[PDB]
């Protein structure tokens, strides 16, 4: 069934599972043509496939060539996502394959169920959680690899850096979703918070800065304030 606030701890148990988010697969810029009509230009996208227990991120880069000559691209994008996730599962050793795949949008259920018919024991589930994974392209190193790709490509990351050496996966996911919610609500301010201290840097093999435990507490408080502030600016509270 669906994943919600009540069965939340299931994410961090020892059954392999993956979240799949398709919000950045089909991306366009809208512009005016010489005749004054409107047209779209696709730009590179990505499937965001995340193991919430380990932080392993399977970032499948969707190159704009995959749309060439195709119709109904927003529909195709869901089936292309399902095709690539299915290929990833088949490429993994049996003992690494997920026992559940949770899709962040309900429109992915049928495309993924159909592409996974060969895996009847892998449960395909929706969620009632509003997760902020659309903001993945606000992480600079992820946006950079997507935009530079000249061909389809899979790139592997750990979205938690080395956090699990010091905190649990529950706490790491809470940190990640707070960071992404902040980047989604006000990208400029969130990035200012994350980078305004030159003395704290991002390791070459990391996505986020090398904050100490105490500094992460301050950063996390600043992101909460940002989200609350935007909430009031929005609603005039």
């Amino acid at each position: 069934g669906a994943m919600n606030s009540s069965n939340y701890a299931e994410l961090f148990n020892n059954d392999i599972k993956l979240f799949v988010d398709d919000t950045n697969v089909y991306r366009v810029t809208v512009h005016k043509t010489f005749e004054g009509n409107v047209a779209t230009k696709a730009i590179n996208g990505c499937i965001f496939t995340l193991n919430p227990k380990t932080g392993h991120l399977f970032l499948k880069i969707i190159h704009t060539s995959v749309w060439a000559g195709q119709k109904r691209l927003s529909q195709l994008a869901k089936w292309k996502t399902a095709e690539e996730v299915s290929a990833l599962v088949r490429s993994l050793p049996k003992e690494e394959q997920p026992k559940q795949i949770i899709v962040t949008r309900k429109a992915m259920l049928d495309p993924l169920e159909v592409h996974m018919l060969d895996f009847p024991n892998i449960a395909i589930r929706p969620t009632e959680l509003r997760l902020p994974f659309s903001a993945a392209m606000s992480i600079d190193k992820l946006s950079d690899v997507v935009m530079k790709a000249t061909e389809p490509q899979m790139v592997l990351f750990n979205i938690y850096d080395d956090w699990l050496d010091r905190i649990s996966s529950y706490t790491a996911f809470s940190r990640l979703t707070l960071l992404l919610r902040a980047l989604k609500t006000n990208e400029e301010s969130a990035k200012m918070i994350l980078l305004s201290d030159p003395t704290i840097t991002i390791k070459s093999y990391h996505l986020w800065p090398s904050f100490t435990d105490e500094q992460w507490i301050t950063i996390e408080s600043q992101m909460r304030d940002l989200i609350l502030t935007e909430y009031g600016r929005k609603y005039n509270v």
Partner: protein, 300 residues
């Protein structure tokens, strides 16, 4: 014109014969139904006055034997049986006809309703769906489950309809996942028609039989089967022209015959709205769309 004689009517019961029905009181001098048209399957069905639970009945074809109904007081139902002594059968049927103890199958001469509802239905195919090989007639009731239902529990008492499942390996070719799910033509034409049913007549026959079991017995699994066979055609972009024109006629007469008061439980809103207004064949069922919009505009 053939006859289904009855030994007696010991319990009060509503008797159906095809789309007709009538009340028999407890111990009323009722000995059967005469003037039954030769050339069609027929169904004789029952609902006891004291327990409307369990409608039940028998599909039969009088060209295949001499059939009679006798009440069994142990099993508590009206049972169909075959009389193998043709002489005793004739002689008994005549006595009843002379004493006018039979109702006459009440077909109006202009009326092709029953033909139109059973056009492709053949006893030999009914007996493969309803397995009981030692009888030439077939028992169905309200509660019988289908083979597909049993997968999701007595197999000898099941309805062996052809399993249709849109999210199944059978329905989806590897590498054509999107194509085959959104346009089911492969599954309809290659898997079902060429592969399993062999021709459209057998497909329509099972469709018509499923509808009739849904309508006469309120059999839920039969209603699921009817809707699935409609939706598979409507969700296919490539269907023979003669099949679409015939489907429109089949459905028109089914919708025409359905009781107005039973439409809330025998018609699936999602399937009909999809078929008439969203699907590939949304503009191919003119007669069915017109009767649906005038008779059941609430459902739509």
């Amino acid at each position: 014109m053939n006859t289904v004689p009855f030994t007696s009517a010991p319990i009060e019961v509503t008797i159906g014969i095809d789309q007709y029905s009538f009340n028999v009181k407890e111990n009323q001098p009722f000995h059967g139904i005469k003037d039954i048209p030769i050339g069609h399957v027929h169904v004789i069905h029952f609902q006891h006055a004291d327990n409307s639970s369990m409608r039940y009945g028998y599909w039969f074809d009088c060209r295949m034997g001499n059939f009679y109904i006798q009440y069994d007081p142990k099993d508590g139902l009206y049972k169909m049986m075959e009389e193998r002594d043709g002489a005793k059968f004739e002689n008994i049927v005549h006595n009843f006809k002379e004493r006018q103890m039979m109702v006459s199958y009440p077909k109006i001469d202009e009326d092709d309703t029953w033909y139109n509802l059973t056009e492709f239905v053949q006893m030999d195919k009914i007996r493969k769906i309803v397995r009981k090989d030692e009888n030439q007639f077939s028992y169905v009731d309200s509660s019988m489950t289908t083979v597909q239902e049993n997968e999701l529990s007595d197999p000898a008492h099941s309805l062996n309809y052809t399993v249709i499942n849109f999210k199944s390996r059978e329905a989806i070719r590897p590498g054509h996942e999107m194509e085959d799910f959104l346009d089911k033509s492969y599954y309809l034409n290659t898997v079902m028609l060429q592969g399993i049913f062999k021709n459209s007549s057998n497909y329509f026959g099972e469709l018509q039989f499923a509808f009739l079991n849904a309508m006469f017995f309120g059999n839920y699994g039969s209603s699921l089967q009817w809707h699935a066979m409609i939706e598979l055609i409507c969700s296919s972009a490539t269907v023979p022209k003669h099949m679409l024109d015939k489907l429109d006629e089949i459905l028109y007469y089914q919708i025409k015959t359905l009781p107005e008061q039973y439409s809330d439980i025998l018609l699936n809103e999602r399937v009909w709205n999809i078929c008439l207004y969203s699907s590939f064949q949304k503009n191919s069922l003119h007669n069915t769309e017109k009767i649906m919009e005038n008779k059941y505009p609430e459902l739509l």
